[PDB]
From a paper:
[name] prevents tumorigenesis by promoting cell cycle arrest and apoptosis through transcriptional regulation. Human [name] protein assembles into a dynamic homo-tetramer and harbors three major functional domains: the N-terminal domain (NTD, residues 1-94) including a transcriptional activation domain (TAD, residues 1-61) and a proline-rich domain (PRD, residues 62-94), the DNA-binding domain ([name], residues 95-292), and the C-terminal domain (CTD, residues 293-390) including tetramerization domain (TD, residues 293-353) and regulatory domain (RD, residues 354-390). A bacterial effector protein [name] triggers tumor suppression by stabilizing [name] and elevating its basal level.
Residue numbers in the entry:
A (entry chain D), C (entry chain C): 3 to 125
B (entry chain A), D (entry chain B): 92 to 289
């Protein structure tokens, strides 16, 4: 009911595919930053939304700035998210497997400017 | 900025019979802190625990406080405020409480208080007086000295002494004692060596 | 093969002696901070080294400072460590039990300057 | 242009106890770099690996830096900036990091930083200080010297000194050491030659 994810200094997650076992009542993602760059130049978050909502999340988050962790405050399209983190930091997020559908496309991604085009995956 | 004044280093045991003590540490090279009785000199390592014992004949009243201040031992340097060197002033060693310029810190005491004196410019660090633990004869304070006797441009290798003063809740003097301090890399060897010239 | 540990606002861990079962392949520390002080004044971490290495890890860690979680970067003497947390935060760490010896003295400690004497215990 | 000042060559250990060290490499014909303890002089081949060991009593904090800089040894030549001769400056041996005029380079470290001092005109090369490896007791930097001592138009048979300075992230001085250098085609033989009058 958990997965470990890495964002590096080259705008890559270490997986493009997360599969949640639906015998899990809650799922947890543990994000780390194995690079050396601080979060003001290479910050990474883990953001969950539907596939249609992903682009909107990215766009508004990008206009929100580093202070808001590049997330639109109180964005209802974000199902779950970590904090934005830099080099050597870590943060985890737990959410209810209540809020997902077997017949629905879900995307995870990072909303730091530019990062989502490469830093994204399915769920 | 030099100070207009010079803090007293006159021993004053006062009403409660205030004395200083120090662990009987010896001079093995592994010691981090060792006191020479003959030289009345503390040899200690940078940022290492430096225990100093408070001994009283009788308990000081509630609200009593314990203050530490460094001054230079030599007369021509006495008016100059003892402070950290530029390198340590700017380094990333903050414990969240102590001011970055303060030579002396107290560890493991959330009531530690640090003062830049408005008028004398002296740095000092005061903690509340606590009686010895049950079965103990003294109160131990755990100081840290955050510059070296060989730092460039701080103490710039000049000798210093620490003054421990006991104060009531209003800051009035109840006792005073003092000891010389050498902050150095190998306190055991330095004490044995300096002790060898006697 | 897991253990839950807290550091309060009084510079105290809620245990001073950890045992890891020989059977375990991996061991997890679950560190939390039920106090109210932020981590620049009451930042705790759970750092594991040999007893012989503890003091060196602590001195070099202190001088590394808050922004390095009070740890010397890349310290070989550190078998495992959480990150620094403050009030309301939690962090876990998992290390292989193959990094331990049955004939060896291990310590766990916080490296926050001046808190190590008070926050330590045997593993 | 001459420099208007002369950098200090005064030894200085500083807060962390800065010393240098050199491999006990002997003087066999194969050796590319050999250090004379009696002369405090290094003999090395042009552009070959010269290990220089950094030794500290305690680890400098992160962001600490290590600078090397050449000056001529003869006082009357001390304001002349040590640089490469025209032939070598213009030759095809740039690693893409060092300026072609700089005598001193660092090999095997992409974090190398080079400086043309805008005020003194001195060249220097600097690397981040890295604490020793696992199972090692010192830090080793690998210098290359890009002219021979006899290079016409450059050092032209005037002995130089290399000055190693340890500095923090803001440039405050932590330690200084120095050694004479001869760059030559047979370092072991030439070390025997110069020790001959001892
Ligand atoms: K890292
Ligand atoms: K040596
Ligand atoms: Na003096
Ligand atoms: Na280079
Ligand atoms: Zn200093
Ligand atoms: Zn040349």
């Amino acid at each position: 009911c958990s997965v470990d994810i890495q964002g590096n200094d080259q705008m890559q997650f270490n997986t493009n595919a997360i599969t949640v076992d639906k015998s899990c009542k809650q799922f947890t993602v543990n994000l780390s930053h194995p690079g050396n760059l601080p979060k003001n130049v290479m910050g990474h978050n883990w953001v969950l939304s539907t596939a249609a909502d992903m682009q909107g999340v990215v766009t508004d988050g990008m206009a929100s700035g580093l202070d808001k962790d590049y997330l639109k405050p109180d964005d209802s399209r974000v199902i779950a998210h970590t904090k934005l983190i830099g080099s050597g930091e870590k943060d985890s997020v737990t959410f209810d497997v209540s809020k997902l559908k077997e017949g629905e496309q879900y995307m995870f991604f990072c909303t730091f400017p530019g990062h989502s085009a490469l830093m994204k995956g399915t769920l | 900025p030099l100070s207009s004044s010079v803090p007293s280093q006159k021993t004053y045991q006062g009403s409660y019979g205030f004395r200083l003590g120090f662990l009987h540490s010896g001079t093995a090279k592994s010691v981090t802190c060792t006191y020479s009785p003959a030289l009345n000199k503390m040899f200690c390592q940078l940022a290492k625990t430096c225990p100093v014992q408070l001994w009283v004949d009788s308990t000081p009243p509630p609200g009593t406080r314990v203050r530490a201040m460094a001054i230079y031992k030599q007369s021509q340097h006495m008016t100059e405020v003892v402070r950290r060197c530029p390198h340590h002033e700017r380094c990333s060693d903050s414990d969240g409480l102590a001011p970055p310029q303060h030579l002396i810190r107290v560890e493991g005491n959330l009531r530690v208080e640090y003062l830049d004196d408005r008028n004398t410019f002296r740095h000092s660090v005061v903690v509340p007086y606590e009686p010895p633990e049950v079965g103990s004869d003294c109160t131990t304070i755990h100081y840290n000295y955050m510059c070296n006797s060989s730092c460039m441009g701080g103490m710039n290798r000049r000798p210093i002494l620490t003054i421990i003063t006991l104060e009531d809740s209003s800051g009035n003097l109840l006792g005073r004692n003092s000891f010389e301090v050498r902050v150095c890399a190998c306190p055991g060897r330095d004490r044995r060596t300096e002790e060898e010239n006697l």
